[PDB]
């Protein structure tokens, strides 16, 4: 009678088995291995350029594949493509609805995506055969609000929505192909691994799931944080990644050991993290706190390497170019700041 | 060889900058409002009347040469902690709540909890709230016939009397005004509990009549901007 209780007890037994297995392969630690090496030192960074083209707060500020141009969107209804070398606005696009929460710059410099509280994803064009930009393809198959989008190739892009269901689209026709479900809370962000075969997704259910694009199933699931997962980024190597939550704690996870590596939390900060990403070599980890600062830590020594002041309001987006030559930040004060 | 690349970029920058300035003029010339509520309080009926005319349902109108864009979220999920942060620059939040649905399942307590969570927010702390009291005719119909009693769901209601500075409509029994003003000053108390010196609240009694209401929100945005301008100059 009531076999669902038996199912639940065997599920928690499997959970205990997983915990014991993870404890079995944790004889050593990481802080004892990173010793005997030289620290990074007190690095001092100076803001290089500032961009003044937005009216409302910037939200996504997606970088470019050519390491020279970038894209940005705000809550005013405008999508601005900037040139970082000459400090010039390459393009300005008016959107259908004012509210936007993410962009996705295509790796071919031809398309660019948007998305917000309108439950639709627009894909524009850049190789203008008539000069002006126009909506090239719309995607409407979700009920919840869009959170993040990352292009994969020239004709498909994976997005995450607020209805605990993410999907892969086929803009060549206009229909979705694969659907990933399993999260209880709305998925907040996603990050594509450099292998172009699998991607990590972070949600509000204090979890992070590793999905396979061609299979559609969930490979691994990590639960180490205690609050919402605001941002998630992938290590450039392909065997680890980092996550920044809403509890003043960022954590480094790996895929092979199936457990967390080290937490970069500190005592004197209580605010939350909104965006986090890695560097070219992965030695430094930049995270955007909610106390109007940006903290860069040593990814190995678990110590603060630098603090970046600036924006009076909260910083909402952080990005690093592919070549690792400069960094870009976007906050709620209508200011885009490129640092070197 | 960089002659052609520079001049075209410069003229494009100038043109798009002039265009974005001309459009920013219009963006600054208008206002934005966010309408929400506890649910099943008559949002369709009031949007048929207030607006007088797919997660983000928007309605644009204009009065006395100032424009307002009212945004509804009646096509979203139940959780409201992640997406509600996008409405930081909105000048007013129209919180329409039913005042007769207390029995049919403590919806008044739900609305009070929602108001308390909104008021003490980290980013919504600088946003005033416009409050409506829907279905006052249903209050009058339910207190006169004897459908339910507020005392069962509110013990301190027995130690409350109608204030003297009230505006009782002629031909109205004192119990209707008692219950309505009890709801009103409970909302006002839960609002003024924290306080910031930055935003305030404004109660209103409407939606019981199907008459005009655009004047109320207009005057509310007006004196809200007046109060924020007074606070900016420290003369408040």
């Amino acid at each position, epitope marked *: 009678g009531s076999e669902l209780d038996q199912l639940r007890q065997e599920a928690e037994q499997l959970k205990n088995q997983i915990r014991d297995a993870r404890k079995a392969c944790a004889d050593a630690t990481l802080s004892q291995i990173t010793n005997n090496i030289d620290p990074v030192g007190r690095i001092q960074m100076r803001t290089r350029r500032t961009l003044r083209g937005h009216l409302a707060k910037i939200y996504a500020m997606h970088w470019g594949t050519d390491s020279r141009l970038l894209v940005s969107a705000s809550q005013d209804g405008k999508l601005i493509i900037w040139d970082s070398y000459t400090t010039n606005k390459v393009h300005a696009i008016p959107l259908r609805s004012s509210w936007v929460m993410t962009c996705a710059y295509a790796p071919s410099g031809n398309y660019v995506a948007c998305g917000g509280l309108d439950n639709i994803c627009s894909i524009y064009n850049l190789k203008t055969r008539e000069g002006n930009v126009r909506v090239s393809r719309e995607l409407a198959g979700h009920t919840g609000y869009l959170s993040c989008c990352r292009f994969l190739d020239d004709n498909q892009i994976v997005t995450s929505s607020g209805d605990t269901t993410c999907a892969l689209w086929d803009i060549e026709t206009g229909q979705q192909t694969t659907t990933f479900t399993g999260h*209880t*809370g709305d998925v907040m962000s996603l990050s594509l691994a450099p292998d172009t075969r699998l991607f990590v997704s972070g949600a509000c259910d204090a979890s992070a799931k590793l999905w396979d694009v061609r299979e559609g199933m969930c490979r691994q699931t990590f639960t180490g944080h*205690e609050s919402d997962i605001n941002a998630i980024c992938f290590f450039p190597n392909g065997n680890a990644f980092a996550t920044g939550s809403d509890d003043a704690t960022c954590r480094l996870f790996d895929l092979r050991a199936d457990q967390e590596l080290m937490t970069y939390s500190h005592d004197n900060i209580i605010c939350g993290i909104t965006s986090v990403s890695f560097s070219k070599s992965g030695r430094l980890l930049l995270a955007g706190y909610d106390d109007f600062n940006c903290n860069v830590w040593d990814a190995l020594k678990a110590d603060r390497a630098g603090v970046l002041a600036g924006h009076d309001n909260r910083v909402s987006c952080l990005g690093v170019t592919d070549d690792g030559m400069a960094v870009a930040t976007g906050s709620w004060d209508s200011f885009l700041k490129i640092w070197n | 060889d960089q002659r052609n690349e520079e001049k075209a970029q410069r003229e494009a920058n100038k043109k798009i900058e002039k265009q974005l300035q001309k459009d920013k003029q219009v963006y600054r010339a208008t206002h934005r409002l966010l309408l929400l509520g506890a649910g099943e309080s008559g949002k369709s009926t009031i949007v048929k009347q207030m607006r007088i005319l797919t997660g983000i349902f928007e309605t644009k109108f204009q009065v006395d040469k100032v424009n307002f864009h009212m945004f509804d979220v009646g096509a979203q999920r139940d959780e409201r902690r992640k997406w509600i942060q996008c409405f930081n620059d909105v000048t007013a939040i129209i919180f329409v709540v039913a005042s007769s649905s207390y029995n049919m*399942t403590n919806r008044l307590q739900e609305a009070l*909890n929602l108001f308390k969570s909104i008021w003490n927010n980290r980013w919504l702390r600088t946003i005033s709230v416009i409050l409506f009291l829907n279905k006052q005719d249903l209050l009058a119909e339910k207190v006169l016939a004897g459908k339910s009693k507020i005392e069962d769901y509110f*013990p301190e209601f027995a130690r409350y009397t109608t204030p003297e500075d009230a505006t009782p409509e002629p031909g109205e029994d004192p119990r209707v005004t008692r219950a309505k003003y009890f709801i009103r000053d409970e909302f006002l108390r839960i609002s003024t509990a924290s306080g910031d010196g930055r935003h305030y609240c404004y109660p209103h009694f409407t939606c019981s009549v199907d008459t005009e209401n655009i004047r109320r929100v207009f005057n509310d945005c007006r004196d809200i901007i007046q109060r924020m301008h007074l606070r900016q100059y420290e003369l408040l």
Partner: nanobody
Amino acid sequence: QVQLQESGGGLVQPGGSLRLSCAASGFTFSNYKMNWVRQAPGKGLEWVSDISQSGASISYTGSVKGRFTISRDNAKNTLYLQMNSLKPEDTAVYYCARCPAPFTRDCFDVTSTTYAYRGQGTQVTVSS
């Protein structure tokens, strides 16, 4: 890994005293704002009570004012709820919830059956 458990429950006649103890694991109990929320068979979720970060602020709904009492404890990381003179309408299932963000007072866990910090619950039902 967040985890919540609760001890309590029974079929007692109207006019008794019941004690429920909610225990948490996987996070710092000395920083968040715990709360109790219940729902009756046939109705939606109903916010019951909350406890602040320290224990100075106490708020009860109208239906339970002055009858049921709560108190947290950071030593055992557990919060205790006490039903005194149980009314015949408290035949509901209870859940011990937790606000999503620390240091902030914004708390709403009455969402429809989807939450990451709501425990298993306990079906408290009075007798006849």
